[PDB]
Amino acid sequence: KVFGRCELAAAMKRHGLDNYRGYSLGNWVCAAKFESNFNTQATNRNTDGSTDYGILQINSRWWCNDGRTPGSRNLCNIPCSALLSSDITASVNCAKKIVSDGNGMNAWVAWRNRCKGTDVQAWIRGCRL
C-alpha cells in the first residue's frame, strides 16, 4: 500500500505513535517519507546482507526474522514479511521497541539526516487528525 501523507499521519495516531517517546507525529511521518516514500512494500538490501522492510525500513539484523541474516536477532518477534502489510500495526509495534532502545529516532539514519531539527510539523500540516 502507498499511503498519502495525512492518511499515514492518521493511521500512526490511531496506533499510538503520536508523541511516542516524545516524538511528535510529524517526526514519524517525515521518517516514513524518506525511508519508504510511504510504501508498505518497500525493501532494501544492506551491504552486510541484512534487509530493511516496510514503511519505516526496519532492519533484519536486530528486529525481525527473514531467515537470511546470519547471526541476527528477531527482537520484535515477527517475520520481516509482517512489516510489508497494508495494516501498519506490526511496523508501529516494532518501531515503538526500536525508538525505546536508547538512541531514540537516531536509529533511523534517514530521520537523523533529513528530519531531525527540521520543521517536521509541515508533514502533518492541514491533516484532519
Binding residues: 101
Measured CA angle at 9 (ends 4, 11), to 5 deg:
90
Written as one letter, the residue type at 100 is: S
Please say whether the beta carbons of 67 and 60 come within 8 A. Answer: no
Is position 35 annotated as part of the catalytic site? Answer: yes
Any contact of residue 69 with Cl ion (CB under 5 A)?
A: yes
Stretch binding Cl ion (CB under 5 A), from 6-14, 45-53, 90-98, 109-117: 6-14
Residue number closest to Cl ion, CB atom: 26
C-alpha to C-alpha distance for 25 and 52, rounded to whole angstroms: 22
- Which one of Na ion, Cl ion, none is in contact with 79 (Cβ closer than 5 to 8 A by kind)? Cl ion
Select from 5, 51, 52, 83 the one that contacts Cl ion (CB under 5 A): 5
Q: Select 43 or 74, whichever has its Cβ closest to Cl ion.
A: 74
Residue number closest to Na ion, CB atom: 72
Is position 52 annotated as part of the catalytic site? Answer: yes
Any contact of residue 73 with Cl ion (CB under 5 A)?
A: yes
Which residues, listed in sequence order, are joined to residue 53 by a DSSP beta bridge?
43, 58
Out of 35, 66, 87, 119, the active site residue is 35
- Which one of Cl ion, Na ion, none is in contact with 54 (Cβ closer than 5 to 8 A by kind)? none
DSSP 55-118: TTTEETTTS-B-S-STT---TT-SBGGGGGSSSTHHHHHHHHHHHTSSSGGGGSHHHHHHTTTS
- Which one of Cl ion, Na ion, none is in contact with 91 (Cβ closer than 5 to 8 A by kind)? none
Out of 7, 48, 52, 66, the active site residue is 52
